[PDB]
Design a protein around this ligand. Structure first.
Ligand code: 5MQ
Length: 301
């Protein structure tokens, strides 16, 4: 009926705002990115600091893991993405092509491709092996806030400040659907691929059937009017929607009822990123520059 997330660890180390936290697909690790130009790796279960990965010339808005947990990709203000070998910390490839800040990134499930979104209003699809840009999609008419592949890699969803969500055929780069005006600050596919979860900067999360163009659920109560705040489907226990908020709380809703089921308190700045562990009822959350910490929370359901 309600989860009971409680604070377990606070992970300090970043020297500026933390932008993104992601659990490795194997459940072992948490990666974080920061305005401090660094990626840090932490133990998912005990929060123990593992390593710092460096090389970007400016702050990093996003990081993402390959399916085998061996590679990371990062999106930076230095206009590049970088592919990293996690074990060695080495930069394998620098992905060059965007003409302004890179804000978001993801591997496809296959992990042979990376998708990126930029201030430059494009979505780019990159070859992991070669580091070359395969396609440049003229995706939006304002900054791209989020990019995500569906569970089989066949589709990409993008969101933008232009107020649109768009679904793209990965293979061809063709736009299959435009969902249509407040800025769209976050989007991702549901695990079953049928729905998209989208955040808009009028303090609203919406669950959409994008084929029909029908809004199924609306989640409100949190504050989201300024920052591109990451949200999640929590699926390991109860079926929840999880998001950060500009009031320094993590919000958790019941997906079906739309009721707030828990608010997690502890952060001292905007919670810009949340992540849900792949197998356990564990949440990671990260905050902006008044705080600079990552917190790990555990629930019994
Ligand atoms: C290095 C760093 C540290 C802390 C927060 C940020 C930030 O907020 N990112 C950002 C910014 C924008 C954005 C949108 C429109 C216009 C501008 C922007 O930045 C400068 C000018 C969009 C998305 C994003 N992100 C947020 C984190 N998320 C995991 C991916 C995307 C970045």
């Amino acid at each position: 009926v309600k989860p009971n997330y409680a604070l377990k660890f606070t992970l300090a180390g970043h020297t500026k705002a933390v932008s993104s936290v992601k659990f490795s697909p194997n459940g072992e690790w948490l990666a974080s990115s920061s305005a401090d130009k660094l990626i840090k790796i932490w133990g998912a279960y005990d929060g123990k600091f593992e390593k710092t990965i460096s090389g970007h010339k400016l702050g990093i808005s996003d990081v993402a893991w390959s399916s085998d947990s061996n590679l990371l990709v990062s999106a930076s203000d230095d206009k590049t993405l970088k592919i990293w070998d996690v074990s060695s910390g080495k930069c394998l490839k620098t992905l060059k092509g965007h003409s302004n800040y890179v804000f978001c990134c993801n591997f496809n499930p296959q992990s042979n491709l990376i998708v990126s979104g930029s201030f430059d209003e494009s979505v780019r699809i990159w070859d992991v092996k070669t580091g070359k840009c395969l396609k440049t999609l003229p995706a939006h008419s304002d900054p791209v806030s989020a990019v995500h592949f569906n569970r089989d890699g066949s589709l990409i969803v993008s969101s933008s400040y232009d107020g649109l969500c768009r679904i793209w055929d990965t293979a061809s780069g063709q736009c299959l659907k435009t969902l249509i005006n407040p800025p769209v600050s976050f989007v991702k596919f549901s695990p079953n691929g049928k729905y998209i979860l989208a955040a808009t900067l009028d303090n609203t999360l919406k669950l959409w059937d994008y084929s029909k163009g029908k809004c199924l659920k609306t989640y409100t109560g949190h504050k989201n009017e300024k920052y591109c705040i990451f949200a999640n489907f929590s699926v390991t226990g109860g079926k929840w929607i999880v998001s950060g908020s500009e009031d320094n709380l993590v919000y958790i809703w019941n997906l079906q009822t739309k009721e707030i089921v828990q608010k997690l308190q502890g952060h001292t700045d905007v919670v810009i990123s949340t992540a849900c562990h792949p197998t356990e009822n564990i949440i990671a959350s990260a905050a902006l520059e008044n705080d600079k910490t990552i917190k790990l929370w555990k629930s019994d359901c």
